[PDB]
Amino acid sequence: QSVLVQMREGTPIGLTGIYQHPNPRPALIALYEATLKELQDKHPKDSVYRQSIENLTAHRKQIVEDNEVSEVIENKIGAGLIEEVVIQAHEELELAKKMSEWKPWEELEEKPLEDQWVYFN
């Protein structure tokens, strides 16, 4: 199934270019479940990245799943508006999908020279 994360036409809210999203909570929780499924499937369980984003979207999804109205959860999240929260959840989801192929949990591949991060000391 597909999900819409940002209406570009509708009634206006304070941020221009961003209009009011119909039914933001099912979009939100399905996008969350995609985040949880991707980082459980593709990142190895040592790595700090998947651990904090797992805990992050779990604690974020708990607020969405357990409270109903618009304004109270957009205060309890503490980030922006719910349209904007859906956009940044979409964004961290696309990030977590790029990280499975860019693979950041390795050791570093390009060691610096010893005389390079030396400024004036």
Binding site: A79, L95, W102, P104, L108, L113, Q116, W117
Partner: protein, 210 residues
């Protein structure tokens, strides 16, 4: 507050290095400023992580530039500046690039960045691989050289005057009526400042044994 806050910034950056160990070489803080020390093939993934994470959403390129130290084998260092307008935070990203090798361009992510990248190109000759409209800006069109570079002199190589004969302006090697007199020769021969104290919190410097 401010002591607590700089000690908080230290810990945030320790987390940023631990989240991406393949790409981040170092981090340094100096007075509520955070610099991330990144390889040149490591630019694009770190910048996507800075744009995209919810803890780390910087969204907005402010200004980028290079700086040359000719005393290093990798000559230029290319520094990026970002601003999370949500979290009210600034972050800095330094890579390196020799005169001849590139650094990859972040203009796929940041839309304002391309104009900055060709500015730093003309001032420094630093390449941005993957960049539409890489060419000079804010210098002369036929200008040969890169100005903000330590081998390039102050007054440059050429000058402009109207030749009567050709009925056009002509470009000629440099002749001055008054030579430039730098007064940098005549600086102090004593060390001017001490080493200075540190602002490292007690939690992030190495323990002494016993």
């Amino acid at each position: 507050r401010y002591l607590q806050h700089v000690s908080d910034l230290h810990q945030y950056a320790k987390y940023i290095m631990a989240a991406l160990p393949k790409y981040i070489q170092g981090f340094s803080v100096w007075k509520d400023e955070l610099t991330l020390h990144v390889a040149p093939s490591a630019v694009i993934p770190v910048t996507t992580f800075l744009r995209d994470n919810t803890s780390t959403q910087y969204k907005s390129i402010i200004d980028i530039t290079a700086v040359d130290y000719p005393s290093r084998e990798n000559r230029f260092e290319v520094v990026y500046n970002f601003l999370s307008v949500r979290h009210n935070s600034r972050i800095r990203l330094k890579t390196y690039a020799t005169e001849v090798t590139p650094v990859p361009s972040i203009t796929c992510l940041y839309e304002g960045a391309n104009w900055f990248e060709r500015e730093a190109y003309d001032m420094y000759g630093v390449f941005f691989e993957g960049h539409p409209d890489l060419r000079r800006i804010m210098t002369d069109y036929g200008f040969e050289g890169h100005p903000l570079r330590k081998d390039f002199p102050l007054t440059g190589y050429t000058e402009v005057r109207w030749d009567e004969e050709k009925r056009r302006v002509v470009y000629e090697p440099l002749e001055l009526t008054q030579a430039f007199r730098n007064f940098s020769a005549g600086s102090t021969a004593w060390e001017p400042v001490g080493p200075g104290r540190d602002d490292r919190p007690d939690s992030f410097k190495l323990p002494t044994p016993k």
